[PDB]
Amino acid sequence: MTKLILYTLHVSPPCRAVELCAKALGLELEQKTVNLLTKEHLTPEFMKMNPQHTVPVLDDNGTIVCESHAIMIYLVSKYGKDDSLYSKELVKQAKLNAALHFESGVLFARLRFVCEPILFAGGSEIPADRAEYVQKAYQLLEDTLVDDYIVGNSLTIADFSCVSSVSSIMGVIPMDKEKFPKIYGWLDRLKALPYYEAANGSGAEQVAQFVLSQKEKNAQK
Amino acid sequence: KLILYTLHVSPPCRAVELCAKALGLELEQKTVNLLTKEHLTPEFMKMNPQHTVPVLDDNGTIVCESHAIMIYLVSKYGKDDSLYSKELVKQAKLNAALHFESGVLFARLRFVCEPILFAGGSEIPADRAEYVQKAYQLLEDTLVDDYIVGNSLTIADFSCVSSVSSIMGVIPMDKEKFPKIYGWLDRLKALPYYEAANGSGAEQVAQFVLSQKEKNAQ
Ligand SMILES: N[C@@H](CCC(=O)N[C@@H](CS)C(=O)NCC(=O)O)C(=O)O
């Protein structure tokens, strides 16, 4: 059997969402690291796989699947032993899709608006409005957490997506525990997963440390 | 019937309008004026804690978020799956495109427009305009076929066109740099319901942003 290949970078939040999902599904990924600093994502071959030139990208026996949310849905749909991680039911699926688009359109987008300029454009200071954009995202997430998980009272791929970015950005933009108790309670649930630290926690800590290090290098230049 | 809590100038609302027209559905549109904070009432927070439009009410079934709404409508009301495939591989291509729209096209549109519309902004910072230019290039490269995914119309087209048609009225989209985007726009514009469901609101929102920008400068 052809083993699954993930074009990936462990410090990348969307890549870690897929790693979490693969662990939950009992899948083993062959990880191929893609160095963005040396433009490994901008080779002709990579751009052929993904014209938007982002990681993660999955190669499943020749079938190329781009984009973390799409990859997770694909993996649950194809390999899941049940639909617990991503419901096939019309209404619950719609709740999950809404949450996944909140992650791409709000959580990750705003994370990137803060981190990208530091990592790729010599940024040495985070503009106040962009930090506040993230604070606003924390509040939106806090209000989304009406139940134990992002959607309902059991773990789903919406949790993997949201935690991958929240765990990263909270190491750069302070997330006040007195303001957002539900986010921290939810993080605690996810941290109890045996695969959480290896699939996500480690890389979330690593990326925040890298962002802060680069920001300081840039400031001290 | 089908109720949409909506604002015609809003790109994600117009994506749903396009989708409903394609499905032959009639929406009862209930306007929510974001400018006067009608989205921040307790009742609206009840339907959607993230306080955004669009929200669909389908005989009491509440569905938030434009992409989720379109998938829901096609799944429940489509005569077939043309607009959103149930097949594993094509569905994944569609999902990737929909998340490109939310995470890149709409996010960057909002990063330009929101400060002007809601925060008294009178400027578009160079870096944010450039962020949109980069989005145009990403879209141009995504268009390897006649539509966003494949060679027939899907909800990924509705999502992407709703935001592209809006932001191009604020951040110039050079036809010499982006010929494929223009070719694709023409395919969407040829739909008999395009102007009513999307084109009009796209023009209105661009005018709104430019007008407010100048008012704020005074
Ligand atoms: N919506 C995408 C976002 C992917 C993304 O932006 N990945 C970043 C790494 S965190 C990347 O590859 N950037 C390279 C580039 O944008 O050129 C997903 O969830 O897969």
Ligand SMILES: N[C@@H](CCC(=O)N[C@@H](CS)C(=O)NCC(=O)O)C(=O)O
């Ligand atoms: N991903 C959401 C985005 C919705 C969204 O941001 N809508 C804007 C109008 S264009 C809004 O309701 N803003 C009000 C707010 O953020 O409080 C979707 O596609 O439905």
